[PDB]
């Protein structure tokens, strides 16, 4: 319903940076935060997404664009309605957005599959 990304800033080439996005709004409240999928973008390119899991093995599952696989990682803390984007070996300068939606999460790598968007945050390598 409402997302604010932070952590943006200026980094030296080959360094690391962690972006943060916290979600809040009516309906969280079925439609809990846990029932929403989240996705990072940066035209706009797909960076990576995340889905929550209550199964036995993981508390969540992630999905990373190929170009980013061996560098960026995504995690989250469900109880704090927060998702993270860990960026290692920066090169990559852009505005990073976080999106969310019932149709978002893993396997949703398109901007139209997310119904809610954040203001974005600037990352300059």
């Amino acid at each position: 319903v409402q997302l604010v990304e932070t952590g943006g800033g200026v980094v030296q080439a080959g360094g690391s940076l962690r972006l943060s996005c916290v979600a809040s709004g009516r309906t969280f409240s079925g439609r809990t935060f846990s029932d929403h999928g989240l996705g990072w973008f940066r035209e706009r390119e797909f960076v990576g997404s995340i889905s929550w899991s209550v199964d036995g093995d993981a508390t969540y599952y992630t999905d990373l664009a190929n170009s980013v696989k061996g560098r960026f990682t995504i995690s989250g803390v469900n109880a704090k309605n927060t998702v993270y984007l860990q960026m290692n070996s920066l090169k990559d300068t852009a505005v990073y957005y976080c999106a969310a939606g019932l149709r978002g999460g893993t396997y949703a790598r398109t901007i139209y599959e997310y119904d809610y968007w954040g203001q974005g945050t600037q990352v300059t390598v």
Partner: protein, 256 residues
């Protein structure tokens, strides 16, 4: 003109409804390009406009007619036609906007709403979530009337939004999932109306993601499982396509 499929709520039976959905599916996809036993919808790319849409004409016992336009690439409703009026959801992009111009040129009055077709927006306007909006032959009959009388200002926007949610589920979703077709069949057989349970709703939410996982799956096995809900709301995950064969009927095209 595009292909028209007919249906009426008057005297409807499990069989008339089933014939209708099967006919819709038949017109939505070539049937070619099947993956893991599941037909895949035409690629939106390079798709000739004269093949982009199909039409669904609905009537009820009050002798009223409305015609829905579906996009064959995702089986979703993009707009409709009632008498001398045709209305359209807000397109996601310019190409889609350009595409829908080819629809219902048959009429003078062409309107485009400020809102899109996503459930979230329609539920907001409706003032009700999918879980609280009854489905069945009864609701569909009433949905058709509302869509029909919208040019008079007599049917309010919430009622219109609720009607869009009913039509989309009983048509678009039914076409996508044998499961949901069977959900309407059960309602129609026993002539009851009732809202969709969490298993229907989560499948609706996940259709795009399920399609993606199946077509990119390593010979059926998903890279990472997808989480759904049972009728009682309890959660569970799926790890491969095999469990979905009797459930999903169409998929949105993806690479490869």
């Amino acid at each position: 003109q595009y292909p028209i499929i007919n249906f009426t709520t008057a005297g409807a039976t499990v069989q008339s409804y089933t014939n209708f959905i099967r006919a819709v599916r038949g017109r939505l996809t070539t049937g070619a390009d099947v993956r893991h036993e599941i037909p895949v919808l035409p690629n939106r790319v390079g798709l000739p406009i004269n093949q982009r849409f199909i039409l669904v004409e609905l009537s009820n016992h009050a002798e009223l007619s409305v015609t829905l336009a579906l996009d064959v690439t995702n089986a979703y409703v993009v707009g409709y036609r009632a008498g001398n009026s045709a209305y359209f959801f807000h397109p996601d992009n310019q190409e889609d906007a350009e595409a829908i111009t080819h629809l219902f040129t048959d009429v003078q009055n062409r309107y485009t709403f400020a809102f899109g077709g996503n459930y979230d927006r329609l539920e907001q306007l409706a003032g009700n979530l999918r879980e609280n909006i009854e489905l069945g032959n009864g609701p569909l009959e009433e949905a058709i009337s509302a869509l029909y009388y919208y040019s008079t200002g007599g049917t309010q926007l919430p009622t219109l939004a609720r009607s869009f949610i009913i039509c989309i589920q009983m048509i678009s979703e039914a076409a996508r999932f044998q499961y949901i077709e069977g959900e309407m069949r059960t309602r129609i057989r026993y002539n009851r109306r009732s809202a969709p349970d969490p298993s229907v709703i989560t499948l609706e939410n996940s259709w795009g993601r399920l399609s993606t996982a199946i077509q990119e799956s390593n010979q059926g096995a998903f890279a990472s499982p997808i989480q759904l809900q049972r009728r009682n709301g309890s959660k569970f995950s799926v790890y491969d396509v095999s469990i979905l064969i009797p459930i999903i009927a169409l998929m949105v095209y993806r690479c490869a």
